[PDB]
Amino acid sequence: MAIAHLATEYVFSDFLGLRLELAVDKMVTCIAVGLPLLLISLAFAQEISIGTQISCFSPSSFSWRQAAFVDSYCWAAVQQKSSLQSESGNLPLWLHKFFPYILLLFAILLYLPALFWRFSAAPHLCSDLKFIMEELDKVYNRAIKAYPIVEQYLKTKKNSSHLIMKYISCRLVTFVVILLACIYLSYYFSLSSLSDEFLCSIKSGVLKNDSTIPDRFQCKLIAVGIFQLLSLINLIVYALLIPVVVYTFFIPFRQKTDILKVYEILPTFDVLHFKSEGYNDLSLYNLFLEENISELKSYKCLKVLENIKSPMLLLTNL
Amino acid sequence: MAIAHLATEYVFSDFLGLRLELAVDKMVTCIAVGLPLLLISLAFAQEISIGTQISCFSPSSFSWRQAAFVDSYCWAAVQQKSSLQSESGNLPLWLHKFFPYILLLFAILLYLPALFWRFSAAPHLCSDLKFIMEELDKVYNRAIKAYPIVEQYLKTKKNSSHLIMKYISCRLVTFVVILLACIYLSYYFSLSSLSDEFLCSIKSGVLKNDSTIPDRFQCKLIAVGIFQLLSLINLIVYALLIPVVVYTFFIPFRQKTDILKVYEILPTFDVLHFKSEGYNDLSLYNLFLEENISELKSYKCLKVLENIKSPMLLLTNL
Amino acid sequence: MAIAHLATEYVFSDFLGLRLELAVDKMVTCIAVGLPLLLISLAFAQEISIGTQISCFSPSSFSWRQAAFVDSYCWAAVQQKSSLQSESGNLPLWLHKFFPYILLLFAILLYLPALFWRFSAAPHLCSDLKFIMEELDKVYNRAIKAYPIVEQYLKTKKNSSHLIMKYISCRLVTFVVILLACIYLSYYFSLSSLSDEFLCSIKSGVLKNDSTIPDRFQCKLIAVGIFQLLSLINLIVYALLIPVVVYTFFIPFRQKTDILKVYEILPTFDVLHFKSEGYNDLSLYNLFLEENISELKSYKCLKVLENIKSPMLLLTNL
Amino acid sequence: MAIAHLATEYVFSDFLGLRLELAVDKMVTCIAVGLPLLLISLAFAQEISIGTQISCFSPSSFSWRQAAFVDSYCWAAVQQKSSLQSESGNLPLWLHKFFPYILLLFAILLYLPALFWRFSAAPHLCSDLKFIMEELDKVYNRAIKAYPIVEQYLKTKKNSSHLIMKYISCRLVTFVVILLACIYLSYYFSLSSLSDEFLCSIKSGVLKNDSTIPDRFQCKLIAVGIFQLLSLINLIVYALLIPVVVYTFFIPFRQKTDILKVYEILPTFDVLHFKSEGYNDLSLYNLFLEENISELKSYKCLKVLENIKSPMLLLTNL
Amino acid sequence: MAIAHLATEYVFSDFLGLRLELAVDKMVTCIAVGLPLLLISLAFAQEISIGTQISCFSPSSFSWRQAAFVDSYCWAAVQQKSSLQSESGNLPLWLHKFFPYILLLFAILLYLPALFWRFSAAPHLCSDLKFIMEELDKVYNRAIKAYPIVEQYLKTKKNSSHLIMKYISCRLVTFVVILLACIYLSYYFSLSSLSDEFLCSIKSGVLKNDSTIPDRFQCKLIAVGIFQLLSLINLIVYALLIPVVVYTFFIPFRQKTDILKVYEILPTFDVLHFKSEGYNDLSLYNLFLEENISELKSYKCLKVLENIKSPMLLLTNL
């Protein structure tokens, strides 16, 4: 089941013609979220394979339940600064017990912006998108017959900047989460190098009275190799993933040829040389325009027409 | 499986174009309910991973089943005031045994207002909403042709104050549940610091007769670290969530511009500058109006027209 | 469950009429990536059947809990260069612990080009294909009546090479991954012969103080036979798979006759003797022309018409 | 569950109206592949019932973990052919460990031609079939009114042999795989009769130093009875199945009357007395003619028509 | 859980309105096949609940793993005539081990005729059925209007006997399998009374050297009571089921009044007093005539018309 389920559940599943996001952001997100969940789920599956994460020695004189009792004690004694000791410094190792669950938290944290952004952004864009493709169908209907309201709309998007700010800030937060994850992994990995062993004592007051108990036990953390191994893998990917966010911004140097110029071929269109040298909603609309153009059939025809430029029968043949 | 199922379930389960609740309140509810159920489910998942929550020491003279007998006895003996002792004060620790299940109860409790509100609010609003959007289609049909009946309807909502009490009271109860959860954890969490260990005695009258039994056993509560960690996480979020309820109320200072003003662009419209300095059901209709406006396509056209204002061909283009 | 589930879900199911990616390449990929995933699933299934992978001996004086404690120590001691020794060289055996998980990684790695290419390439061709499908329907409509724009389109594809470079480089990377897997297995497999026996010591400082512990333990890795077997199976197949990539390139020597010649039967056709002796997008279009030709009913009639050539009533019979 | 679930899932899953592949060959394949997969599934189900396959004795002085450690050692030691000895000859018994998994391989192997043939053959024949049934509907439409193009097509199939060779070769390979399976079982089964027992020694160099270990252990293979039983059952069936492939070839001696003769009743039909005494694509079409005739509603009418021969009213009644 | 599934899967499911195979035979088959598989599934469920089928006692000095080692030995020792002793005759007891699986085989075997008959017979009758219902729809059209083609068709069915032979032989084979099952159980059941006990010796040549091993062990077979119980139940039903096959044959003495006489009421019909005193396909057609008559609405109308006989307005009202 499990691996075949994961083949469906991670590998096949897409849900993890209008497009309300640029796909790469979903792809980045699906990658970004999917790998740790996989890493988490694999670690959890390895827990099921191995069992448990820790032990102290115990004398052979200690009975079966006494050994169980003691090991759970030390496993509990973990919580208290005084009751266990390792010279590597107890608190971060105490954090080592915490560490697996924080991984899950990190995975959760990355999901939180994505879900919120889905609800925040989807309705405004969809209506806009449906409107804009309808405008080209109207132009197409004008071509059948054979103001720039959407431009006037677009010039308002050059005046407006309200919603695009919402997008940008959402990018930074998730990125910051990634930074902190990368940092967190780095911090953990670095100490993970030597934090393997710790001593226990169980000598709470009655246990303190029990002269049979040795004063300390030698004890070790076993999942650390998995932790350190898994941490490295995801960190490397994420180190590369941060530059991906950077490309989203680089729009005006990226705008070396204009999408509007392909519409400019239409007599229904005008000198929309709308290079957003000032950053404005227009740049968002330009990006989603070419994104949504990936749906638009006629734009390929316009490219063919542009390639032919590189007519009415052609238009008719459309 | 389960982790990937739940994670994808957290992605997929949107059930957790008319809108009969404001999305943020649904989101807040889905968040508010979802986090503890997750926390509960994770605690339960960790129960499956660990096993059991407690032990007393046992002399090696006791067989492991005799030891198991004793520990389960002490786990039962818990219930008596006289049986087990910890000088940290027994009853809250006796509550500590209870403490996990109350967490589940709290999650349940938060859902109970939501289920009731679903049945209470949904039918009246839907018919109202469907009517209202139909009125704009009629206005749209008047635009095709090119009394303030819904206003007279809306003025009924001004005079009506019945439904708003239903909404507000439902908010407060859930909030109170949230308060008590926050408080309950707060009460728990402070004492949680030192309430780890307790003694058992097993000397039920025959066990009281048994000379071989030592008088007391030293014993500890192990799940507390989960309790301590999980409580803190949910509390912080909830502390922030209480201010969210406050925004729902802040309507008249929020009413700095009016939805009806966009309808004022219609010639089919009149004085609806209804600043709700007194509160009315109409104000709640106004909130759902802008909520449901997120569906209405033409309102974007009105905004585009407003932006152009910032015509009949444009109306014709619609 | 598992065997029938694997048979249905992996072996039967297509979840792994236009052909926006080549079926054989899909088949190659689906088969090629399916084999390790199956092998991985079988290793995982055998893990469930066996249990665990390793042991050292231990003195009978150790309790079996102590033995489990010791064996996990040695299993942990694995991570540290000094604490275990095998004179065959420690790092590869240390890698042998790592070795199963990298297998999974390899399977993962091969999937990554496939999904990325799917999102990149599929939509452009779909518009092109349906365009070209409709072109022949238009020709068919001319036959009903009884510029070569698609050629002019095609001549641009001879001028262009932009997207086809993306395809080719995607092939090489996956192939390189295949190379590395094959090489990686080769590197492992030759060493494997005795790189399975190792000594342990547990003598960390307190354990170092314990005089009862013997200085070393003799120990062995057990899963290696699975490794030996599974690696060989996949490697041989994959060696054969590399020549498959070569056929994809060999197009101009492969194109000893042009599919356009069958269209030459149409009076709606011209000197499209488009042998891409210089490689161009045209060669991709030639491939997909004949690929998508497998869909077209009319072309099948045209192919029958070629056989017939080997008329208007024939057209009428169509 | 499993017994009922598998049996029903085997029985109902018909995937395990044009007839692009012969049902009997599918049936043969579904039987041929299904029985071992069942047998493999039953073997695995018995693994779940039994547990494990093997043991060596060990002294009672050994700890049970030492015993488990030794037995798993010997189970591992298997791999070093030099390390264990049975005077019956080690390699086949060493192969006996391998033997279960190869069974699965054999089942897999037989599936490989089937899925390949599905993709290779189906589309070409669909075009041929779909038109030819449509040809008879056209003849039926001529009957409504009341060149042999498909014959001219068919005369090419007498000239052509390219695609039919693809089918025939695919039959023999799968058949040969069955031969090898049968032979493999034969080779296995005869020696399986006594290849029961082996000696272990665990004396890896430190264990070689351990004087307490007895020099050899007596050890035996347990699952072989299942092997011996399961092999015989499937082999017999396959012995019968080999003659089935032979019938597929025997077409011209089988073609003692022509399916085309029933079409000869049609005054639209001609001298298609096409007995493929030379083997040609025609014989495939003759097969599929009668195969697809099982689809064709009207041909049953033609049988009734033939039975009446054994006319315009018949057309009227049809 | 499964019991509800078992209720769905065995009890509820019908796939286990025309009738291409007789419902009663399906019922008989579904009963006949269902009961043993149920019995088999129930035995296996209780196998999981109890455990395993066999033991020899041992000295207590043998470790429990050595005890399992011996029991598995003797369980293996089963396989050879020399390696175990009982005076009740070794082969049938050796068969006792085999006996459960053969039960499954028997159930499988009974399914094999049914599956084949499904593919062989169904399509021919469907065309025939559609023809016949359509002829009565033509009677209905003839009723609206207000050669014996189906008779001429039927007279060929009296001349032909080809397909009906296929049906009859299929019945006998399955019945023979039932006989053999009944006989097989009978053979088993009579011996069962004391064939429970056996001696083991583990003295394979090294074990043969071990003086500590007692020369024989006393040993017993445990599942046999299930066998005794389950065999009896299913056998009795099958004893009754054999007479059911006999009724299928008894057609001409059963045909004391003719279905065709009901059609004789139609002025469209003729003297089809077709009692198949010579057995011919006609008797199959008569069977399916009344079988499919259970679908045909108008025949109930004809029965109503017959009941009125027991007119044109009636025809009009019909």
Add this chain to the structure above:
Amino acid sequence: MAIAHLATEYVFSDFLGLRLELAVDKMVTCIAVGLPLLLISLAFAQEISIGTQISCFSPSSFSWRQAAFVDSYCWAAVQQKSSLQSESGNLPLWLHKFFPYILLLFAILLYLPALFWRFSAAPHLCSDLKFIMEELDKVYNRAIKAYPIVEQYLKTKKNSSHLIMKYISCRLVTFVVILLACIYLSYYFSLSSLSDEFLCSIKSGVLKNDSTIPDRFQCKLIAVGIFQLLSLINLIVYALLIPVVVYTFFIPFRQKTDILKVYEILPTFDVLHFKSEGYNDLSLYNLFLEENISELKSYKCLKVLENIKSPMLLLTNL
């Protein structure tokens, strides 16, 4: 899962506007058969919770697997008359082992009439029902316009009794099964008593030779309290179910007012005072008539008209 699945599955499986079986009989049957299946399912759940049904003591000198073998021996030895003794009389206790499975048998038995009758009765009535509701639609069409063939049909049903006999006999058999179940439970419950305790002896001839074995062991049946408890619960209900069958018969004294009298309101009606003082199919038809009348709206209209009686515009208002 299980509790919610069972509760929902039991309640919702309503398949366990025409009404081809009378609901209360269906309901009672479904309900009646649900109760033991629930009780059976509960017995399974507690068996899974408890484990074994039985134990004998054994000396602590016995090894635990010997003792494990001892108990299973005795559990097996159960089958023999001489192997174990309780002076309460052994055979019913020997039946006690049998007793659980007979419970399942009883549940199965009660299902057998239901499924048969479903196939036997449903088609004949459906044609009749659809006919009869069509007759009222014809009367309704006569009302639109504004022989008693169904009466003449019904008069044959007073002459006929063939199918109704099939129903009545089906009632008795299931009732008899219920009687026998009730009696069987009564026999078991009353007997159950002290019979839980019995002695084992294990002295199979070698064990008979073994001097170490004490001659008898004291042994008890544990689940019997559940058996006796479960038996009482179902029995009481089922005693009440017997009177339900009686009501089905009491038709002519029940026929104090008539359905046909409501149709007598129609002018399209005649002498239909059809009190079945002679029991005939008419009574069956009358019962299903009012059952199926629950669909037809006019009967309510006629009742409202009967209230008015207690017109053509009223008919028109219909």
